[model samples]
Target: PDELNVSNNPHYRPKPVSYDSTLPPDHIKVYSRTLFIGGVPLNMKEWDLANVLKPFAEVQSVILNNSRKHAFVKVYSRHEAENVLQNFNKDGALPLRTRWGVGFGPRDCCDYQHGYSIIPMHRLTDADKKWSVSAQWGGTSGQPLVTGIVFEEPDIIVGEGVSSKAISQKMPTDSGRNGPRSGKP
Candidate 1:
């Protein structure tokens, strides 16, 4: 007579993989220190972006692509980069129609937690709902594109060898014809 053996069960359960221990030393220690902002305005200058970003963190460098429509900002530390990314992704930070890349890459990792979310978009939190909504879903709000982020437009200066020092040196009282105009009448 075979009785139900609740106390003594014989079943095989595979051990879970420990990815942290398996990862290489370089991979474990790696923390992204740069953020790649896609869909940047073509006319947005590096200097202008640097000015805005300087308030959030120590912006080490800014690289802008005129035709491709993107910007690469390198910050002082991994935490600085993470902070900037979070601040930028906030409701008011990004414009109404602005959209930014989020998930799985060096550029998107700062915003992600525990690698990435496997849950469906609709099942996520209210913030996710707001950002993921689209025409198909009949939801009016969606993530903003690059144009949504506010950036100050830098004044254009036309010259082959114009320098900041040259511009600053030309005081208002300077009546020299070659002096740089302050763009004032």
Candidate 2:
């Protein structure tokens, strides 16, 4: 019973009042753009989502992101957003699938605590310099932190010697399947 500490909730605590190490690390940046909204029934109106989330913050809008499959509620701040996550995430009561998790992150070791893929911050690495243009104009990194951001300049410096072309070409190959397992090499 020493393994158990406190809490009426089924969730475990490693140090009676601390986080459980068995679980993946807690999100560091707080829940950002990608919200966890799943298992919600299609019938659940966007207004219903707004109502559930409004108490946490000033909800700008609630969008049915995937044709009533799920929703994305835009709140005023990260605190409110996180509150929304805590209340709804993995609760298993929504009309649909019910599992919820944040989406759209460049989240990684540099930005996220648990190495979630996130927007790459300015770096002095060769890889960054190659992707600087893409990371800049393409905006593939993430939902810009700034709301309605119309104009901005990337100050992140990628290191020298790394060519963007090399990164791009190899990225897909590395990400997908195992390449030539047990090959001639």
Candidate 3:
């Protein structure tokens, strides 16, 4: 056994932290109509926040977490959501300092770091409507960072690619219905 149990020791220094590998290789992209707003005032009211964002989009609901000073705004479409992010930042946007994150799940709200969860208040007005204008707007590439394929534009490309040949090459040569067999066999 070691002379001192570092597991229980409060002053133990195992190693210096390294964040080089943790950095994203490219600019992080968010493809959802939901906006996670952080750094909100504790005394902030949900309707007040909704009113500010109303000019930009038709807010479906406002989920405010007063204890943690954050909220989630769900808009009708990606266009309106992008409008919120584009206009709500910088010095002249709003009175309070607000940080925006985009994602679908509850973790999108600052990655759910705080133990508190947002219980959304439905504030839909008669003007409120669902459905995104662009069918392909709020979708991702369905790939991870390792794919290394990047698109400058977010528009979806459908069908007819060089990969079709590559996919065909992987097809089985023989119809072995009796038992499992390798492609070579």
Which stretches of model 3 miss by more than 4 angstroms?
A: 1-33, 91-93, 96-185
TM-score of each: 0.32, 0.32, 0.34
RMSD of 2: 21.9
lDDT of 3 by residue, 151-184 (tens): 2233332456565343334555765457766776
Candidate 2 similarity to native, TM-score: 0.32
Residue 60 lDDT, candidate 3, scale 0-100: 71
Better of 1 and 3 by TM-score: 3
Task: Give the per-residue lDDT digits (tens) of candidate 2, residues 95-168.
Answer: 33322245353325454454564342222122333354355464423332222221244444435685556433
Of 1 and 3, the candidate ranking higher by lDDT: 3
Candidate whose lDDT is highest: 3
Scanning candidate 1 in windows of ten residues, the lowest lDDT window is: 144-153
Screening candidate 1 with a backbone cut-off below 3 angstroms (N, C-alpha, C), the clashing residue pairs are 97-144, 97-145, 98-144, 98-145, 99-144, 99-145
